[PDB]
Recover the amino acids of this structure.
């Protein structure tokens, strides 16, 4: 029985211009790297968890002369889909809105329930996950631009130690019994790996042919690293440092090539 | 910060012939992978530790006809030289002796002292390390034959949470500031990477030539995996599984080739 | 006997940092570290032990209008562990505090009741002698080089074991220095860098073997000026420098034939 | 003056065939190196001792197919003759019997009497010595084969601090006023120095001729070291390591040569 | 846990003429023979020590009509260098001065700290050593001449018994893990071994050639012994008795000879 | 704020003097004078004013048998007036005390309640800044060089006006120094003498114009040792000295063609 209390960096908050609503959601399970960078790592060694305390804090990093609004909401059951309308968010159990340049906390309620830590995709969200967090942004007069970050302050109890869950993520991960460090999106012959959280990582891309795929490319600011590429027996070894959520690795293969293979290790 | 109790596998025990004692030692430190395969991982998230309970147990697995002595000893002064004489060993602070067919437990005494956990070789062993364990054997009928294993039972309390440590080991680490997953051995153009403990690993070997080094080879029963080799820009991606301590990855290079680079990740 | 002092001192001047990538700065808390205890360091020279009873870092803004940016402070009591390199790493520290550029914030470092030896040299065991390390981080600003605010340390220490005065000059004791850590070196092959820890007036002397020995040294940094007296005969340089901000650098490159150079630093 | 508790190695135990008992004895005295290898050293700094706890434990190391009896006995009258008969042995004050595969402990009783520790043979055994221990074996299938070792567990309190005793042994000591590290045996021109216990020693042999004696030779498994020999002014400097009791240094001399001189230092 | 109280002879005090200051320093660690002749020997069997009481007593052995002054000082941390100016000594934590013909005590302060007994040169003085003693002499009107001696009166507690540290000192002692009985100083082809403390010793000098080195010579009063020399295979066996600190063994080799070898045993 | 300190320090070691002619030694009482305030001088560096409330000089003998000799102490509050040269002159001082070699004696210097500025440099008005001058005198001994006793200063001072740290290095400011008076020079035509005021570890650097400039410097005194690094190319000397008693001397002789040499002194 291990009790942890810490305030970690959850995500960066960028402004939203326009009129159509913009949403970002999370989930809340200690297995989720996107939410608990460090905690997820400790979580690999326990079967259960119980949250004693939980608060999401919005910490502005912009001037007082900044327009815009930031809203946070929480939902009891992770199985329900996030809101897709500004009305839905508001009909949600709890929500808080604040001016972009003003700090504000969302203190999430806690049941005494102790539950299993999710093992795979086929697990029941209602039984294994805690809830879901939602962020919304509007009223800014400048596109993507950081205005603040939100930190997660928690106190959860890990228990029932067990064998260490798997630490690497692979292309052929059956039932996603592995962690989710990166999420892929395929657009024809172009492949995109989106690094879910900030951190140090190592990704290995492998191919069949030889022309296979072109040397991969790093998309977005806040991502740097070393890309070791070798055409013959298409292979790339990328040692990256993502200093922000959602950075991108882009690889383009030949129509000749079969879908690419990859693994991600935590550095 | 909380406590943790588990009994992990430490090492297998092979026979030794003759009246002349054969030794093995381990320095007790939470970041020493060799002693705490699982725990070492957890330990990379705290600055201090305090062991409250620690006992080493020898568990036989051999036939009752075996001959031989198996003895355990502990010295709380990790900086002092390991014994060399049979008397040297028995003159240690605390020791226990038994026959190969008979189980025995060495229950180590504890100081209530809380201490910083080692960041690198250069930290003072007397300030950071708990002590040293010593295995001694002799009098067996035949050499390298397994006769039992020894497990480590503990209860330690981690504290002073902090920034996560280096999780990967590279061929150019700052005075052992990274975990020691593997220990290199060189004699000419032949390189050996001794894998410290049982587990799942991924090792990457790089060169700088074309024929720099030949496809690497696996030594020892209980080591297996895939060795993905490519001569052009000498590179090998070995995804291994080791069911026993001290297994070996052997790689030979061209007299022309520069000394190799390697990195080892936890799988 | 033993003395107890309390004082506030300027720790640093904060410059803006551009983009999403964090910039870091760190300080090791030790009574003889001039970077942190300008005046106290002198006094500290006459005792063997110290105990900190109160310690706080304050950030005070110098801007108030349209200035965006994050300013964060963190502390780590394991003075020998590596400094952070990642936004994540930093926030995972034992204690940290965040703020926006135009809003003041304080970091109160927790204190243990431990009395410890004051560091006599670069080879002392940091875990035994140093109190901890302080870390500043900045990123997210629009303008590159502008002063945004200042950092102050407010302390209360107790000096205690009296002895003969310690060495006041730092000298290259063939890998590792000898006295107060005025400068920290880093060798990069044939090139040598001496990082002058704190702002001040200093005098450094570099020596060699071979007459060709090393090239005339160079000053790297916006806040380092001085007079360099080079003599390529018996390889020697006498530099009287003026650092007006922490971390400036003195660069020297030697001949592959030349042995590792030696040096000394006097406090003017 | 303070107390001390330790369990030291006493001797190895070899088999004995036949129905006729084979014996071994040891006189319990803190300066008797044979019984207290380490302690004997400490003991050279006090004038008195008092044993509060003493137990001899036999620890097997043989296969369960071995045949044979192993028995231990104690007699608090060190001056009395050791037994010769099997009944003689079992009629002793306290004894314990066991089989070669089975561990057993002889727990010796204690008088609270505090006594002077022996300075030399001439001191009255009844006034100075604690008693005598006896090992007996018989019924084994084959002769000199090791079957276990016996350790000595004690708790004694030293007192009446004084001037340190002689630490070296010379070939011309005043009625055993020096430690007995070695015991000489002579038959003609052949000299044997039996090394009493396991340990590190340095023996020096001197002659008085030119060819006085040949380079000395080492007898027994578990004895090793350097023998630095020089014929002109017959001299040998042997730095040995003995991993077992009763090892032998053998030196042969010229019929002309005078009986040799030797000195033995602790290493 | 052994508690010792004894008053042993620390050193001889000789007069100092002239005007330039004269200093002598010690250190204070039970491993230091120079300070604890007998105690150092017992200390070889324990890992830790704690000083309960400590006083240095100056005991004059000269007439009342003797001019001169004697001063003693102590420093908390053994890492700091001894004073090199009369001002430094005086700025020291504690100091006491007395007339040469008058007895005087220096009672050193004690922390409750229990620390490890130094194991080698690479140990941390601040963590493992107790402090440092300094002696100064001046105002005498006759050169080297004994005027008194200083005795050390202590009460320290030895604890955490372990395997016996090494007892001999050798030329090739790596990291000085051995005791320091003698300190060498080389002046070209002349070698000097300075016997640190009074006591009985045995030193063995060995060479390569044959002319190797001339029969060694004893320098200083208060040193006598037997020197057994043999030219062929340069070897010397010296059984000495130093009745005072700093006596000297002098050996001169040929330019032909390589640096000499030697070991020192405690007699 | 302001601090008050009390401490006893070794002032000097007394050697016997032969004959009827007196030997003299003097000290100028000033908080930044290392000769008198070894440890305090460092602290004094952080204030502007001081006030002495208690001051005593003690002579303690080191002999007791057949040692003849007079030992006398005197004080003068006019720190700028010349030191005595005559037995008479000395005894005509404001306050003096006499004793025989084997008998201890104390001199208690009277105190005024004046708070004054601490001397920032060699050109400060002694009457305004210095407290006074102490004088030792000896003569009448039978043996020439033997230590006869020691001198100690026992004081209680109040430091008070806090400011930025003062200069710690002394530099030849073209006739008259700049910082603490570590050394006092006297030019005798083409020869220059630097008298090192107090025992300690020091580093001195001498420079010139003409390549021939000046001869390699010499150490004058029984208690001065060190390493001199001479380079007759660009006339320069780098001396790392060790004075183990007050008043040792560094001698340098220059070319008649050479301009007055310049120098600096660092405290190690
Ligand atoms: Ca110190
Ligand atoms: Ca001023």
């Amino acid at each position: 029985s291990m009790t942890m209390s810490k305030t970690e960096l959850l995500s960066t908050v960028k402004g939203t211009t326009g009129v159509i609503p913009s949403f970002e959601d999370w989930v809340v399970s200690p297995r989720n790297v996107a939410v608990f960078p460090q905690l997820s790592l400790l979580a690999t060694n326990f079967n259960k968890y119980r949250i004693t305390a939980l608060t999401v804090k919005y910490s502005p990093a912009c001037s007082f002369e900044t327009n815009g609004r930031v809203a946070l909401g929480f939902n009891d059951d992770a199985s329900d889909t996030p809101p897709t309308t500004k009305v839905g968010f508001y009909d949600l159990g709890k929500h808080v809105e604040t001016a972009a340049q003003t700090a504000k906390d969302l203190v999430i309620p806690v049941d005494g329930k102790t539950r299993f830590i999710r093992d795979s995709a086929s697990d029941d969200a209602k039984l294994v996950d805690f809830g879901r967090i939602v962020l919304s942004t509007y009223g800014f007069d400048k596109a993507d631009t950081v205005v603040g970050e939100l930190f997660i302050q928690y106190t959860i109890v890990l228990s029932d130690p067990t064998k260490t869950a798997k630490i690497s993520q692979a292309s052929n991960d059956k039932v996603s019994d592995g962690p989710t460090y990166v999420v892929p999106s395929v657009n024809g012959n172009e492949l995109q790996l989106r690094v879910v959280a900030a951190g140090k990582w190592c990704i290995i891309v492998r191919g069949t042919v030889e022309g296979g795929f072109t040397k991969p490319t790093l998309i977005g600011p806040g991502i740097s690293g070393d890309v070791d590429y070798e055409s013959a027996r298409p292979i790339a070894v990328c040692e990256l440092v993502t200093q922000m959520e959602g950075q991108i690795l882009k690889i383009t293969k030949t129509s000749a090539e079969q879908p690419l293979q990859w693994v991600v290790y935590r550095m």
In short: Residues 37-43 of chain E form the longest helix (7 residues). The radius of gyration of chain E is 20 Å. Residues C 48, 117, 120; E 77, 80 surround calcium ion (ligand 1) (CB under 6 Å).
